[PDB]
Design a protein around this ligand. Sequence first.
Ligand SMILES: *[C@@H]1O[C@H](CO)[C@@H](O[C@@H]2O[C@H](CO)[C@@H](O[C@@H]3O[C@H](CO)[C@@H](O)[C@H](O[C@H]4O[C@H](CO)[C@@H](O)[C@H](O)[C@@H]4O[C@H]4O[C@H](CO)[C@@H](O)[C@H](O)[C@@H]4O[C@H]4O[C@H](CO)[C@@H](O)[C@H](O)[C@@H]4O)[C@@H]3O)[C@H](O)[C@H]2NC(C)=O)[C@H](O)[C@H]1NC(C)=O
Ligand SMILES: *[C@@H]1O[C@H](CO)[C@@H](O[C@@H]2O[C@H](CO)[C@@H](O[C@@H]3O[C@H](CO)[C@@H](O)[C@H](O[C@H]4O[C@H](CO)[C@@H](O)[C@H](O)[C@@H]4O[C@H]4O[C@H](CO)[C@@H](O)[C@H](O)[C@@H]4O[C@H]4O[C@H](CO)[C@@H](O)[C@H](O)[C@@H]4O)[C@@H]3O)[C@H](O)[C@H]2NC(C)=O)[C@H](O)[C@H]1NC(C)=O
Ligand SMILES: *[C@@H]1O[C@H](CO)[C@@H](O)[C@H](O)[C@H]1NC(C)=O
Ligand SMILES: *[C@@H]1O[C@H](CO)[C@@H](O)[C@H](O)[C@H]1NC(C)=O
Ligand code: NA
Length: 581
Amino acid sequence: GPYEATWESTDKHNAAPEWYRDAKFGVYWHWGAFTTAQYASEWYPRNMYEPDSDQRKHHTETYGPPEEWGYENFIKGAKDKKGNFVQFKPVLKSKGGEFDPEAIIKIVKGSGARFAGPVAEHHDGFSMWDSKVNEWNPVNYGPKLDLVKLWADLVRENDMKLVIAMHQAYNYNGFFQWAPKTNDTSLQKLLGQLPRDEEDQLWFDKHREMLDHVQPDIIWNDFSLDSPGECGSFEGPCAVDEQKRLEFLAYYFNRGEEWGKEVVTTYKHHDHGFRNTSAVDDWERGGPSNLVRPYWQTDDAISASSWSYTVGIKYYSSKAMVHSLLDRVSKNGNMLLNISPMANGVLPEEQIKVLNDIGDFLSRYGEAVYDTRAWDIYGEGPNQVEGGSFTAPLQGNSSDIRFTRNKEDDVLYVTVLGWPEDNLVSVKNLGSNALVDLESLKSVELLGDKAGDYVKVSEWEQSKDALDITLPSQPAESLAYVLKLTFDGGIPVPQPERGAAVFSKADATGKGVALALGTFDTVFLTEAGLKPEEIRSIRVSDGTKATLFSGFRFTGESKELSAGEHEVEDGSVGSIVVSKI
Ligand SMILES: *[C@@H]1O[C@H](CO)[C@@H](O[C@@H]2O[C@H](CO)[C@@H](O[C@@H]3O[C@H](CO)[C@@H](O)[C@H](O[C@H]4O[C@H](CO)[C@@H](O)[C@H](O)[C@@H]4O[C@H]4O[C@H](CO)[C@@H](O)[C@H](O)[C@@H]4O[C@H]4O[C@H](CO)[C@@H](O)[C@H](O)[C@@H]4O)[C@@H]3O)[C@H](O)[C@H]2NC(C)=O)[C@H](O)[C@H]1NC(C)=O
Ligand SMILES: *[C@@H]1O[C@H](CO)[C@@H](O[C@@H]2O[C@H](CO)[C@@H](O[C@@H]3O[C@H](CO)[C@@H](O)[C@H](O[C@H]4O[C@H](CO)[C@@H](O)[C@H](O)[C@@H]4O[C@H]4O[C@H](CO)[C@@H](O)[C@H](O)[C@@H]4O[C@H]4O[C@H](CO)[C@@H](O)[C@H](O)[C@@H]4O)[C@@H]3O)[C@H](O)[C@H]2NC(C)=O)[C@H](O)[C@H]1NC(C)=O
Ligand SMILES: *[C@@H]1O[C@H](CO)[C@@H](O)[C@H](O)[C@H]1NC(C)=O
Ligand SMILES: *[C@@H]1O[C@H](CO)[C@@H](O)[C@H](O)[C@H]1NC(C)=O
Ligand code: NA
């Protein structure tokens, strides 16, 4: 294909294709030999060896000292201290067992997921497809099933895009740092003890083999691609060889061309291993506090404590999952949710209930989520996420709004995260302090009990503070409620209380983009709908200043502008910093 293994070549790949931006919600699952112990977390293979750890204590009490009863015994099978045979060995329901992958995929489809798939290989050295490059796989050992192909075929049967998650970099960058050294070269491959050049080649070879095997639409990657400092006390670069990373990107993007598919690869947003030119940034167990461009995603888990099933595990509420989805989508991201089957392949009913509830929401209110795009302001209200990876899911109430809009940019969806007891929704960013003219607001509708049904909202007034909307009769109960505001000729450009707005015409009219406090480079402004060379005026809010830069990303000649309206020379702006005074 046309891609070469260089940054410059692979940069030209379209990172986030339109189907992926339309999709919004996906589901994957950490299920593998690391689940076998059903203890602590998916890091059990690492921590069972850790000096003085609870996991080591548990392991020693249950199986044996890890120096004798090593991690590989979960894959190959061994008796525990009470004589019970232990092995990762799911058995299909069609064979009399408890593993029903078809039922799990139907549950996932029912949740509203538009992409789905397995962790194909975590940090633990176990490839879960029929692998020639890695003998540590579930066709050779355990269930004698190509689990990744089974999942992939079922995802395609059920008309979802296929995501495959790969975490095989940390395998040799410290995950197994406390495992005994071995001279068994097969066992070295499991435990990440091969020579580093061989491990770097194996990282690529695993990707190549997997992606030719199941042709994924998205390849999700974990950290240690190039994340120095993130691999704890292990002495190493916490990285994959740069050449092998580039070979992966070129190989996958070339296969995408060959297959006639727009493919996606993701990586952890703090990791430096790929570039946000051609790969999508993934925020782990969290997401930004602000609207971020370019398009990004969250991957979060149904449990706070683990990605993989453990005995006694507790789960987030449906409310937290739906409100968090709305938050990410409003901020220009997708949300990929991890679920956690037990070692025997059963999906616990508490998890099924969460997925069912998400699906009830999306099947009713999907118009406000699927196929939408972020507005320029993501939302309003007192309940907000902290921002960053490893932060708490959102749980909001009737005081909170999240915005989305249609592709035609003349419908604004106002999603309220609870039913207002006062029967009032006040939208601050559509009030007159926001300098919003509502002459073009043609209709306000409440989305009803099933998709495509609307209840007319007849009473509203625009105050200084807000567009004050009086609600019709409460529809069937739901985790959030959606107002649909339809405009003649496009949604108005709001003036943030603190922030700015930029325009394509010289007099603060025309195409516009509202900006919060923050830093907005050429990529941001372009994706928001206004190439910076087309900016011809800016309105800076009270208590705010804006600094215009000629450069792409806060370099070059700069000019500071205080509160008020200002004309801007065509082709003079590349990026903008909006700051509180
Ligand atoms: C005190 O404060 C000062 C000022 O803030 C601190 O200085 C900063 O220190 C940084 C860390 O040393 C330094 O960043 C480095 O800059 C060099 C030159 O620009 C850059 O090459 C470095 O990037 C490499 O290393 C990082 C890990 O730090 C990797 O994440 C990265 O991928 C790069 O790895 C490549 O080079 C390595 C050799 O250095 C190879 O081992 C590695 O395999 C990889 O090689 C591949 O890629 C190459 C291209 O990247 C390619 O040529 C090669 O063939 C392979 O394909 C890193 O960014 C800052 O520049 C520096 N800042 C200033 C202003 O001086 C200082 O740390 C503070 N002190 C303390 C104690 O904290
Ligand atoms: C996609 O990946 C790419 C590639 O990795 C990412 O690009 C990187 O983006 C970085 C963040 O923008 C950028 O760093 C910036 O580079 C400029 C140019 O060297 C530098 O001036 C920036 O430093 C300022 O900003 C940082 C915060 O980002 C501050 O910590 C720092 O003290 C500097 O602050 C000053 O400027 C800011 C404006 O940027 C002000 O907000 C701040 O208050 C302060 O203002 C004073 O100085 C101003 C003059 O500079 C003046 O106007 C003002 O009045 C004050 O006197 C920062 O280091 C990287 O260069 C860039 N890398 C590449 C290779 O392009 C990109 O972010 C990724 N995209 C996403 C979405 O993550
Ligand atoms: C592993 O091989 C090295 C190299 O021959 C040798 O020095 C070491 O003793 C071997 N390890 C064990 C446990 O015998
Ligand atoms: C919603 O949450 C906000 C912030 O905690 C709180 O001030 C408000 O009273 C809550 N609304 C209801 C109806 O509980
Ligand atoms: Na690109």
